[PDB]
Design a protein around this ligand. Structure first.
Ligand SMILES: C[S@@+](CC[C@H](N)C(=O)[O-])C[C@H]1O[C@@H](n2cnc3c(N)ncnc32)[C@H](O)[C@@H]1O
Ligand SMILES: [Zn+2]
Ligand SMILES: [Zn+2]
Ligand SMILES: [Zn+2]
Length: 428
């Protein structure tokens, strides 16, 4: 709470303000999760209650699909696991609510259980969340209804559903204020709601970073903050040019960024770096390849749900072949396809393929992103772990050290993830 304040940020609604100075790597505040969910694919790898990544995980006898550190965690998570335990077994293979429906069901359960202001709502309350209901078109309003139907379909037993479709308000609120809990390699662990953290506005030049210590959100300065200065995070991936960033912010958050980077368009020429080839491309040759680039990102986005790894790798190489003609290999659109391919090799357990892609990525990655970037820290981590795994321990230790350098600021020097990497350098 201390040394910070809620205020009306002009043309940004409510926001967070500093009342004291903050230095690079300082914890402004922590926020316990108000409501949270462990992602289906991480069940058994982490405790459902505290999110501890351990090996001696005790399975829920009643459903065989919830794992905990012990019985104390099992007991504590029951008021929330109660919502899914029996349904999972009764519906079996037919149990498929989206993580949004899963999280929203828990928000409804927390309101029944704890109607009072929670210690997660010191400055902002879930009830007070911005919905953007008024800007929702007929397509978006319909998607919320598909999700309201699922909430009724699967969580009808223990929940008393509110008013009309003032559930449309709750779903829109989660869509606009919800959080994704990622791991040290930026892999999806789950979804949560953090009220006080949701008060911070967006900047493509963030002065803070949100990291997670179990289910607790921690906010640390990645730039020096002086009194009266507004505290800003990044809502989106900062690799992309101004237009791309702004299309994402408009679609998901109903606003346009007017920050230094968006006003100036500084990193745009380097991000979409054109080959300095004998006879230039032409204005329309760039614009046609950028239209092709965006299309292939989205085509791969779709494809990955239904194509084989080799089919998926072919898309990467053939996209990079067509674009190679116009675009430099440092070009963000080239980097995207290389990252995707690295991801495919990792899945196939092709460690050399993944390492040979990661090396091509890291240098332009560091350049296109800010100084302390989780995107670059995790890329150093994947590289260090690929090196260490393949027995190239010199290069592994250097890449792992590079990761730790960023993490000491973003995660804090005393973070479990950092003690884990240090123990990776000690043994192997
Ligand atoms: C997670 S909330 C942040 C707190 C918020 N302004 C409020 O008072 O509820 C997200 C919403 O805040 C606004 N917002 C965040 N960053 C912004 C920015 N840089 N410029 C304009 N509006 C912004 C948009 O309405 C966005 O959808
Ligand atoms: Zn636990
Ligand atoms: Zn169970
Ligand atoms: Zn911006």
């Amino acid at each position: 709470l201390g040394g910070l304040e809620r205020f009306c940020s002009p043309g940004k609604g409510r926001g967070l303000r500093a009342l004291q100075p903050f230095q690079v790597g300082d914890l402004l505040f922590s926020c316990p999760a108000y409501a949270y969910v462990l992602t289906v694919n991480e069940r058994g790898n982490h405790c459902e209650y505290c999110f501890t990544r351990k090996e001696g995980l005790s399975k829920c006898g009643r459903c065989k699909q919830a794992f905990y550190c012990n019985v104390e965690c099992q007991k504590e998570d029951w008021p929330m696991h109660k919502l899914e335990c029996s349904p999972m077994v009764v519906f079996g293979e037919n149990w498929n609510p989206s993580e949004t429906v899963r999280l929203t069901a828990r928000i409804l359960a927390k309101q029944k259980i704890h109607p009072e202001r929670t210690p997660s709502e010191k400055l902002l309350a879930v009830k007070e969340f911005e919905s953007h209901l008024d800007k929702l078109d007929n397509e978006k309003k319909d998607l919320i209804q598909s999700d309201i139907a699922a909430l009724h379909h699967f969580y009808s037993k223990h929940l008393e559903f509110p008013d009309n479709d003032s559930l449309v308000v709750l779903f829109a609120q989660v869509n606009c204020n919800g959080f994704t809990i990622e791991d040290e390699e930026l892999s999806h662990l789950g979804s949560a709601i953090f009220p006080d953290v949701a008060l911070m506005n967006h900047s493509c030049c963030p002065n803070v970073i949100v990291t997670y210590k179990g289910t607790l959100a921690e906010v640390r300065a990645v730039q020096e903050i002086k009194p009266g200065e507004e505290v800003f995070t990044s809502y989106i991936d900062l690799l992309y040019p101004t237009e791309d960033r702004n299309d994402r912010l408009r679609d998901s958050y109903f606003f346009t960024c007017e920050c230094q980077e968006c006003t100036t368009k500084d990193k745009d020429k380097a991000k979409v770096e054109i080959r300095k080839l004998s006879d230039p491309p032409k204005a329309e040759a760039i614009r046609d390849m950028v239209r092709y680039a965006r299309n292939v990102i989205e085509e791969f986005r779709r494809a990955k749900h239904y194509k084989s790894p080799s089919e998926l790798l072919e898309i990467c190489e053939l996209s990079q072949e067509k674009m190679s003609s116009v675009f430099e290999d440092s070009n963000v659109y080239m980097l995207h396809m290389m990252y995707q391919a690295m991801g495919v090799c990792l899945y196939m357990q092709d460690w050399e393929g993944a390492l040979q892609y990661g090396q091509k990525i890291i240098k332009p990655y560091s350049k296109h992103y800010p100084l302390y970037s989780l995107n670059v820290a995790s890329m150093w981590l994947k590289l260090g772990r690929l090196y260490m795994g393949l027995e190239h321990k010199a290069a592994g230790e250097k890449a792992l050290k590079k990761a730790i350098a960023i993490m000491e600021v973003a995660h804090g020097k005393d973070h479990p993830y950092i003690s884990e990497i240090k123990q990776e350098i000690e043994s192997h």
